[PDB]
Scaffold this active site. Sequence first.
Site, PDB file in Angstrom:
ATOM      1  N   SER A  39     -13.972   9.347  -8.782  1.00 27.40           N
ATOM      2  CA  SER A  39     -15.335   9.665  -8.353  1.00 27.40           C
ATOM      3  C   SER A  39     -15.281  10.430  -7.030  1.00 27.40           C
ATOM      4  O   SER A  39     -15.888  11.499  -6.894  1.00 27.40           O
ATOM      5  CB  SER A  39     -16.187   8.385  -8.233  1.00 27.40           C
ATOM      6  OG  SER A  39     -17.557   8.669  -7.989  1.00 27.40           O
ATOM      7  N   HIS A 157      -5.008  -5.581  -1.454  1.00 24.22           N
ATOM      8  CA  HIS A 157      -5.621  -6.439  -2.453  1.00 24.22           C
ATOM      9  C   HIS A 157      -5.179  -7.893  -2.332  1.00 24.22           C
ATOM     10  O   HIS A 157      -5.290  -8.653  -3.303  1.00 24.22           O
ATOM     11  CB  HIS A 157      -5.320  -5.911  -3.853  1.00 24.22           C
ATOM     12  CG  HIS A 157      -5.944  -4.578  -4.138  1.00 24.22           C
ATOM     13  ND1 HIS A 157      -7.309  -4.376  -4.107  1.00 24.22           N
ATOM     14  CD2 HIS A 157      -5.396  -3.391  -4.495  1.00 24.22           C
ATOM     15  CE1 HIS A 157      -7.575  -3.119  -4.413  1.00 24.22           C
ATOM     16  NE2 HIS A 157      -6.431  -2.499  -4.652  1.00 24.22           N
ATOM     17  N   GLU A 166       2.387  -4.149  -5.157  1.00 19.66           N
ATOM     18  CA  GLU A 166       2.641  -4.957  -6.337  1.00 19.66           C
ATOM     19  C   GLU A 166       4.117  -5.006  -6.688  1.00 19.66           C
ATOM     20  O   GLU A 166       4.851  -4.030  -6.519  1.00 19.66           O
ATOM     21  CB  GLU A 166       1.830  -4.471  -7.542  1.00 19.66           C
ATOM     22  CG  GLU A 166       1.963  -3.021  -7.894  1.00 19.66           C
ATOM     23  CD  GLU A 166       1.588  -2.826  -9.335  1.00 19.66           C
ATOM     24  OE1 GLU A 166       1.581  -3.857 -10.042  1.00 19.66           O
ATOM     25  OE2 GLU A 166       1.313  -1.685  -9.767  1.00 19.66           O
ATOM     26  N   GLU A 209      -5.281  -7.564 -12.249  1.00 16.47           N
ATOM     27  CA  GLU A 209      -4.273  -7.245 -13.245  1.00 16.47           C
ATOM     28  C   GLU A 209      -3.631  -8.493 -13.831  1.00 16.47           C
ATOM     29  O   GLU A 209      -2.691  -8.378 -14.621  1.00 16.47           O
ATOM     30  CB  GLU A 209      -3.187  -6.348 -12.645  1.00 16.47           C
ATOM     31  CG  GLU A 209      -3.643  -5.339 -11.562  1.00 16.47           C
ATOM     32  CD  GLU A 209      -3.779  -5.938 -10.128  1.00 16.47           C
ATOM     33  OE1 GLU A 209      -4.205  -5.199  -9.218  1.00 16.47           O
ATOM     34  OE2 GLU A 209      -3.489  -7.142  -9.906  1.00 16.47           O
ATOM     35  N   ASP A 244       5.410  -1.180  -6.784  1.00 19.36           N
ATOM     36  CA  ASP A 244       4.454  -0.166  -6.350  1.00 19.36           C
ATOM     37  C   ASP A 244       4.092  -0.460  -4.901  1.00 19.36           C
ATOM     38  O   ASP A 244       3.336  -1.396  -4.614  1.00 19.36           O
ATOM     39  CB  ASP A 244       3.207  -0.116  -7.226  1.00 19.36           C
ATOM     40  CG  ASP A 244       2.219   0.934  -6.752  1.00 19.36           C
ATOM     41  OD1 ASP A 244       2.591   1.752  -5.885  1.00 19.36           O
ATOM     42  OD2 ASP A 244       1.075   0.966  -7.247  1.00 19.36           O
ATOM     43  N   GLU A 294       7.449   2.789  -6.967  1.00 24.56           N
ATOM     44  CA  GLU A 294       6.378   3.773  -7.052  1.00 24.56           C
ATOM     45  C   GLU A 294       5.732   3.948  -5.678  1.00 24.56           C
ATOM     46  O   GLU A 294       5.629   2.994  -4.907  1.00 24.56           O
ATOM     47  CB  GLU A 294       5.352   3.344  -8.110  1.00 24.56           C
ATOM     48  CG  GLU A 294       3.902   3.751  -7.878  1.00 24.56           C
ATOM     49  CD  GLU A 294       2.930   3.157  -8.941  1.00 24.56           C
ATOM     50  OE1 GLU A 294       3.390   2.476  -9.891  1.00 24.56           O
ATOM     51  OE2 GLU A 294       1.697   3.343  -8.806  1.00 24.56           O
ATOM     52  N   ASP A 319       2.433   8.346  -7.952  1.00 20.41           N
ATOM     53  CA  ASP A 319       1.096   7.948  -8.382  1.00 20.41           C
ATOM     54  C   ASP A 319       0.097   8.675  -7.488  1.00 20.41           C
ATOM     55  O   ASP A 319      -0.407   9.728  -7.870  1.00 20.41           O
ATOM     56  CB  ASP A 319       0.950   6.414  -8.354  1.00 20.41           C
ATOM     57  CG  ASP A 319      -0.487   5.928  -8.629  1.00 20.41           C
ATOM     58  OD1 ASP A 319      -1.229   6.560  -9.416  1.00 20.41           O
ATOM     59  OD2 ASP A 319      -0.859   4.864  -8.079  1.00 20.41           O
ATOM     60  N   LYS A 344      -2.100   8.405 -15.820  1.00 17.46           N
ATOM     61  CA  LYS A 344      -3.437   7.832 -15.918  1.00 17.46           C
ATOM     62  C   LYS A 344      -4.325   8.872 -16.616  1.00 17.46           C
ATOM     63  O   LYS A 344      -4.737   9.869 -16.008  1.00 17.46           O
ATOM     64  CB  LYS A 344      -3.947   7.448 -14.526  1.00 17.46           C
ATOM     65  CG  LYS A 344      -3.157   6.295 -13.848  1.00 17.46           C
ATOM     66  CD  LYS A 344      -3.561   6.126 -12.387  1.00 17.46           C
ATOM     67  CE  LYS A 344      -2.977   4.861 -11.749  1.00 17.46           C
ATOM     68  NZ  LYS A 344      -3.179   4.769 -10.224  1.00 17.46           N
ATOM     69  N   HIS A 372      -2.216   1.512 -16.777  1.00 19.74           N
ATOM     70  CA  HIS A 372      -3.616   1.096 -16.821  1.00 19.74           C
ATOM     71  C   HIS A 372      -4.347   1.557 -15.556  1.00 19.74           C
ATOM     72  O   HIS A 372      -3.775   2.190 -14.666  1.00 19.74           O
ATOM     73  CB  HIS A 372      -3.715  -0.420 -16.940  1.00 19.74           C
ATOM     74  CG  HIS A 372      -2.988  -1.143 -15.851  1.00 19.74           C
ATOM     75  ND1 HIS A 372      -2.949  -2.517 -15.757  1.00 19.74           N
ATOM     76  CD2 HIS A 372      -2.259  -0.675 -14.810  1.00 19.74           C
ATOM     77  CE1 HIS A 372      -2.227  -2.864 -14.709  1.00 19.74           C
ATOM     78  NE2 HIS A 372      -1.796  -1.765 -14.117  1.00 19.74           N
ATOM     79  N   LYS A 395       3.035   0.381 -17.653  1.00 21.31           N
ATOM     80  CA  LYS A 395       2.511  -0.586 -16.698  1.00 21.31           C
ATOM     81  C   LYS A 395       1.053  -0.840 -17.095  1.00 21.31           C
ATOM     82  O   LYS A 395       0.186   0.032 -16.926  1.00 21.31           O
ATOM     83  CB  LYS A 395       2.644  -0.058 -15.266  1.00 21.31           C
ATOM     84  CG  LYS A 395       2.078  -0.987 -14.224  1.00 21.31           C
ATOM     85  CD  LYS A 395       2.332  -0.524 -12.785  1.00 21.31           C
ATOM     86  CE  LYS A 395       1.578   0.750 -12.435  1.00 21.31           C
ATOM     87  NZ  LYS A 395       1.342   0.773 -10.969  1.00 21.31           N
TER      88      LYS A 395
HETATM   89 MG   LIG Z   1      -0.177   2.734  -7.825  1.00 24.62          MG
HETATM   90 MG   LIG Z   2      -1.179  -2.332 -11.318  1.00 26.15          MG
END
Ligand SMILES: [Mg+2]
Ligand SMILES: [Mg+2]
Lengths: 433, 433
Positions: A39, A157, A166, A209, A244, A294, A319, A344, A372, A395
């Site tokens: 967006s 997060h 992650e 996730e 990641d 990543e 990414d 993606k 995802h 992933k």
């Molecule tokens: Mg990522």
């Molecule tokens: Mg993930």
Amino acid sequence: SITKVFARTIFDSRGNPTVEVDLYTHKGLFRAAVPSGASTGVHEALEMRDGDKSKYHGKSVFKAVNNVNSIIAPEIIKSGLKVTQQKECDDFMRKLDGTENKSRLGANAILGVSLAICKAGAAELGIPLYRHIANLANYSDVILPVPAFNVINGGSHAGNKLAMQEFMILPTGASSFTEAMRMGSEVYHHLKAVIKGRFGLDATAVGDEGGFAPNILNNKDALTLIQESIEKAGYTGKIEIGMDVAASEFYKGENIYDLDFKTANNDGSQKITGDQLRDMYMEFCNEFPIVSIEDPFDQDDWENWTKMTSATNIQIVGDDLTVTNPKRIATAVEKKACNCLLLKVNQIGSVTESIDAHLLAKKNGWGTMVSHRSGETEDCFIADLVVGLCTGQIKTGAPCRSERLAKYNQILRIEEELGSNAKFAGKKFRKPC
Amino acid sequence: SITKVFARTIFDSRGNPTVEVDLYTHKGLFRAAVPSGASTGVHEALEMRDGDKSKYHGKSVFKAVNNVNSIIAPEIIKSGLKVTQQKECDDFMRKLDGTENKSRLGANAILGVSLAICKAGAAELGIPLYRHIANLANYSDVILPVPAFNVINGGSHAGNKLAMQEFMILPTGASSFTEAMRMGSEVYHHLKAVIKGRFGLDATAVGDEGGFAPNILNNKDALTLIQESIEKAGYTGKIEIGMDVAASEFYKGENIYDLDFKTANNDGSQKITGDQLRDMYMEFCNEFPIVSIEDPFDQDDWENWTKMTSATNIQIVGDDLTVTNPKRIATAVEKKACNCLLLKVNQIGSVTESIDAHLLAKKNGWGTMVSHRSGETEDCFIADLVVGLCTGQIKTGAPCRSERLAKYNQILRIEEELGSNAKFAGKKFRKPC
Ligand SMILES: [Mg+2]
Ligand SMILES: [Mg+2]
Ligand SMILES: [Mg+2]
Ligand SMILES: [Mg+2]
């Protein structure tokens, strides 16, 4: 061929509206839903949000639904293009929208249609969706991917002090996708019990996730915790680790990363240079079975990407670096910044362009990891995507929350359909096909 | 009619194996999957688990899958029964099992076929599943349900020391299922933001059903937190509360319930009589807009159920007390223990028995609330079930986690299909039809 195109709003895994498209041929209904997006993004395809902060706190997609129903649908039905002409349909739609980032009609308006066209295209030719995708990428053989399960979470997060986003487990040593699901899930369940006694029951609740964000103290400790669960499960040597980092999140500029970026007004103890960070990764890579990292540096810190890729023998995944964008991907190839694309579909906004970005990566020696988004749906398209594109790696979540299991379940169903022709990527997840 | 029945393993939303069934007719493939309760009442029909601790911590369903593939499939095909005769198919499988609790083949084996038979019967008659279900229950009109969203959680599966298990919000004041969704999601996001500021970011991690389990100190506060959230969203007066106490979990034995059962070696300060429990419920209903309480007493403490249903005018839901079982329901009706049935298809194990249970309840003045299990899948059967059975109420999760949204999204799709004939139960959720 295309007799009806119709968009509705559904709710994604995080409770927010998103676009779903129903498309009709003489062979029936083909349905696809769109995952969360950008967006706002300098180089992403733009998802169109209504922005009325009094409806759904600005996240509804009535405009995008309306763009399908009142612009795309009549235009592409009138075009006479068939659902077996994926590229002609995707091109037609990009031209109709007519902007680089699909921001007139919205990327979520276009992708829903492109994905349904692709499902209908396969039914028109009497083949499964992953076989049709394989023919569109000109693969004569498919392969079942190693799953990359999110398990431990840090970064922006999580409330812990972990700066890296992650930590993932990869059953590269399974003999089949079926064993890989067993390996992924038993480790998850062993990890969950460890977490319950070390951090308490509330540490057992899951993020977007389906993985955990307990009050781990440092990044190394996350790796150690994962390592200990692999061993409790009896799979030491059959499971490897992916990461990641999301390093843009803690980039300060002038070659400085802050591993304590989540502590406001900090003392600068954990601010370090790019090469100090690179050395940190190599320490990790020496102690733990890490095979993929990543976003190890900021989306624009090319210098540090190139040196790490040159210095290591592991997968380095773009990414935020590459945002599924052929132009950015080309730069990253030119500079040798990484050796694997995170894919993606909704970041570029069509099936053709998603296949094209995968092929640009494969043509230059890169792997592709299908990904995802944090806001997923019950849609399982990328299950067929990863198999049809023969990338060997996806992933798409912890083995928890059905917006993730829907994908892993669809791969199991593909494994079953393929019988003896069902090769598992295994140790060759990076360059399988 | 039935040409093939094949069962497989898939993973449910908690990362545990479960049964999925493919049934084929000349009309095509019909797929259904079986949910699973994280905690199962003692009188539930037998979910069949392999119990080999070395595989999937004993949770694989290989035997149940084989019971479909190697017993039910060849027998039901040989029988020539048609997917249009639900009861006779269901009766045939029950007789093929021979036990009262479906312990020979598994309730999870029988329900998967039963659910798929039901979907194939609808296709055979060219009608949506909800219409076929409605016809199977001799209903002429269908009604969209008020959704019951599990927002705040306590009980055996939360860490917060709240003894009552689920706090739910019901947009009984909505004008349409679409608006009920808008209200549920907007309240959910506001609640999330309230929890973040007051309890921290990690308190925003979700439980099995997508809701929150912050460190609330008493049950009153949970209800207070919800009231606050409903006001933040600006919907006070359109949203009512429901509760699932799950009292069988803190029942001591002789009319004594322990509200601090999650504190080990506690003082007896929180142990109380059923009569004091019922008084607590009355004070809550007096202060907060509670319209429904489920399993307020133990699954066999009949006298407190009867006393509370007598004393109150709210909805009193049997869950573990009735286990979707016509025999248990018959007892409850005779003792006027409750006035609403929680309908869980896998508690009884067939579509026919499930419909039978609702019909017995309806015949005796009760409501019916269709329910998910904590272990759900991407399957969305119960969305059509609640619509076809006209119950006016469904509890299938917070608006978070796609095993929950899948059901809410299917009701949105049915709402669109019903068009101008679409009626929302609204304030008549207890007795809408
Ligand atoms: Mg990522
Ligand atoms: Mg993930
Ligand atoms: Mg129960
Ligand atoms: Mg209950």
